[PDB]
Amino acid sequence: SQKHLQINQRFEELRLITQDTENELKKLQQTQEYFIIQYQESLRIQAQFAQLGQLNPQERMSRETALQQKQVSLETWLQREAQTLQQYRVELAEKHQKTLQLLRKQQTIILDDELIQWKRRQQLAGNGGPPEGSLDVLQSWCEKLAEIIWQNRQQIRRAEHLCQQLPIPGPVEEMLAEVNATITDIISALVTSTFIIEKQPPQVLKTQTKFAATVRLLVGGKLNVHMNPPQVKATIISEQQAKSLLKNENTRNECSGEILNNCCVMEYHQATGTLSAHFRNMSLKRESVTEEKFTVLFESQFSVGSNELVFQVKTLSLPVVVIVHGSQDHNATATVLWDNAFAEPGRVPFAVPDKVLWPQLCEALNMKFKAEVQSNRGLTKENLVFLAQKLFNISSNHLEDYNSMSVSWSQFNRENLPGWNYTFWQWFDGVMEVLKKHHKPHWNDGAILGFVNKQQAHDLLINKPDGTFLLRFSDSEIGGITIAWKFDSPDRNLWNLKPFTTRDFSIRSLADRLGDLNYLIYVFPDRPKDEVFAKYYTPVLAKA
Amino acid sequence: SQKHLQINQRFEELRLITQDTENELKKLQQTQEYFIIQYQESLRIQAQFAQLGQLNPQERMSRETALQQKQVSLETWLQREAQTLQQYRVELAEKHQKTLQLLRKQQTIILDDELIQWKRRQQLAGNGGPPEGSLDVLQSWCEKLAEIIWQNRQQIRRAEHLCQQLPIPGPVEEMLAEVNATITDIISALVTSTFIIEKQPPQVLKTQTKFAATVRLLVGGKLNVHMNPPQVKATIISEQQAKSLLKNENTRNECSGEILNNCCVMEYHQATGTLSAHFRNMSLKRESVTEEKFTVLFESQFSVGSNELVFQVKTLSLPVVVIVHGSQDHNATATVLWDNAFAEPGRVPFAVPDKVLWPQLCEALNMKFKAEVQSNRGLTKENLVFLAQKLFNISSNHLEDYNSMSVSWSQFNRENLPGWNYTFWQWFDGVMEVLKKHHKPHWNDGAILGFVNKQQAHDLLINKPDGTFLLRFSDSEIGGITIAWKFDSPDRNLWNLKPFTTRDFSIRSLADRLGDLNYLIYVFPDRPKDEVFAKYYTPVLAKA
């Protein structure tokens, strides 16, 4: 790693720049401490004038002398060191000005690039993108950040203590107040933005279903919150409300969503430093219902340090679709897909696009596809087209054509496809559903060609040996696969039988179904049937 | 170490007893969490009765059935587990009852024996007793204590959270409130009694003199105070007032002593865990003055943990004698001596004895003597007697006689000794003073016999060779040594010359003074002069 082993320096600079500011602070405080006993040694040999009243002749005239002379030297040191004391003080305040600037840099890079990114990594994991990865790498980052910021805090707080104990009419009250002004901005940043959802709630949940979330606070380790673990409170909130929550005009109470059976205590795992909070059993109650976005809000409150600073952290869950149904996991699961894929960075809670360029839908589709069917046999160059053709209802036969096209939400899952009484997503969903339902092996196995129309089925087979067939996703019927084969006295309606859905496949399996049919001789490319299915045929204590 | 490597177990028991109470706590909270979703599964299949209103014929009569049956079983589990939940709850409360009892034991041993003892070790160090030793061994103790008490704190605080979230009319509110009642008593103990003076202020100080103290808080390491270091405020207070401060009837403000130039911020040394506070430059202002005890009070305030508990620690300095003088370090230094030696454990601030049995004054005298003259040539059996005879003004010639005698303060430093116009302490003081002033080497060296009266001088020498002499502490004169020798035409007033004090020994040294006199031939026991002083004669670029 390069860009990471860059912040490991930006840190150890911060370490040493921080490690010398209290090296100044300390001696600059020896200064004060000494200067103060001089201020006083002065006052001492001064009220010594008011006490020369016990006065011999020559000698207590002539010690007015040694006294006045010891002042002339003192008041000189005292005046001379006053400006030493003011200067050093300024030096050190603009030294903080400096360490902070670099710290605001690190903070920014950590929080706005690193975390934002691990966050989207998660978001895309929603549509079965690659796993976020362990938070551990960022925590180290953040506690390292919290450690070095919180020092510099107690550092200028000692500086206060000094200046507020020996006033020095100067530019210092400002610099101090300005420097103390930015260090509080840098903490609220740190604290709030590090209160994050580790394990995200189920994106499509149904009323009364046990689900979980794990929220953690990365800084909780260092600046000391573990000391008495705060309660984090879950509360389900509408999209409309998440908008109101952000531009802080609430009535911090309402929650277009209503109660859910869990709201738990945080818990520190010593020797990981992870201040987790696992909600391992929550529950729900209370232009469509299927397009209704809700978000689970996680709020917690607590004080940092011995006490002074006290915060209320808030964090919104990725969006969620609540379904009181039989099941339309399917329609919701789209509005979720589209949200996870296309969310703009910092969109005001649930601002999704309305249209999207085909090749971006493509990588969403593909990602969810592979994740769902659990193969890395993705939607190949051709596959993407079969789709583009289906979705767009146009002939254009090679992909790069669509690069500039645009799909509305409504052309994805509002408008039903030309032939049919289902949407594009409906179709594509039913594909992933039957596939991951019965035919998972058969996919990376290669057995089900799938993304082909009656015509392509017709061409790819006509000149092939007798019994050559393929498996094709039936637009024919609501989520199935038709078997098209070819035997020689065929037709322009050449041999293909009517679709099998999940029903058929439960009552009896495809591999078996294929194995009973004699005309079906080998699976498209050339390879014989037994070969590609005999693994999956069902036996008994049976015969020849 | 045996009695110490006993608490290292009593600790690791506490560790494991504590380490399993949250093992119960945790599962006893899985229980609750589950039981709660059952309470709810019950309510679920209950409002299912109010919703059978969509009711076919036979089948929604005959599902009133499966419903009532699913309750009969639920309500049974629910009743049955409620008592499981109540019982475990009690088990764990009386399990804390248990860990705390053992912890109150450890605490007690640590604080009241160990610390009290290291404390007296220090107090006696006042009279030059052996050094306290490093606090480090006790801190480990105390943070180990603070660590294991503070867990058990967050532990029952989780128990609250549970019972205060699922009420259970029972014996538990008590046990919890009783158990929580003792754990707060055990902390105030811990916090307050571990705020201690590491380096004690100078026991006899004069107005406007730079002095220092170091106060530390042993728990500051673990339970988290370092997080923003508190200010500790020094304030000089009378004996009279220390009495009022204890039986809390102050007007927390007054201080029969008045200001002193210092009041500083605490400071954590990471990787020692020591939360020190060094006052490395304070300063004083404002039936005798020489018997006036004052104490330096150190007070500090702060909150432990995230915040909840907040304390004000107080700690009193060993007593102090303020002198606005030329110098009577001497009289003060006695009233300090007698205070450090004889202080009863837990005396209401400055309750000193009035009389004391000789042999205990003896070990005080001896201790200070060796410390002061910096030799481990102590007051020998005989020496102690020479004194006892001097102090008591009686003939009794061997020590064990005095074992039962008693010396009043007034017979120590009020009544002047029979012959003289000085007290007993005055004498003994001036002995240590000239000794550590000029003759430190000569003491362990053996050169000055010292604790002998004119008569003993007379006997020990009469039959010795011509020029045999000794050095004898002159009651003769205010803080000196007379040289008694013997030459053969002598007298019953046999050869001894008048005392030399500090004056004489400055203007010219004893060794030199002895080396000029020819009649002085060898130093008592037998050994020749040059032998025992030629080390210490003064040269020049001189001759034969």
UniProtKB/Swiss-Prot annotation, chains A, B:
Reported modifications of this chain: ISGylated.
Domain of life of the native organism: Eukaryota
Modified residues (Phosphotyrosine): 536
GO biological process entries: activated T cell proliferation; B cell differentiation; cell population proliferation; cell surface receptor signaling pathway via JAK-STAT; cellular response to cytokine stimulus; cellular response to granulocyte macrophage colony-stimulating factor stimulus; cytokine-mediated signaling pathway; development of secondary female sexual characteristics
GO cellular component terms, A-Z: cytoplasm; cytosol; nucleoplasm; nucleus
Subunit organization: Forms a homodimer or a heterodimer with a related family member. Interacts with NCOA1 and SOCS7. Binds NR3C1. Interacts with ERBB4. Interacts with EBF4. Interacts with CD69.
Function: Carries out a dual function: signal transduction and activation of transcription. Mediates cellular responses to the cytokine KITLG/SCF and other growth factors. May mediate cellular responses to activated FGFR1, FGFR2, FGFR3 and FGFR4. Binds to the GAS element and activates PRL-induced transcription. Regulates the expression of milk proteins during lactation.
Membership in a protein family: Belongs to the transcription factor STAT family.
Protein's recorded name: Signal transducer and activator of transcription 5A
Originating species: Mus musculus (Mouse)
The gene coding this protein: Stat5a
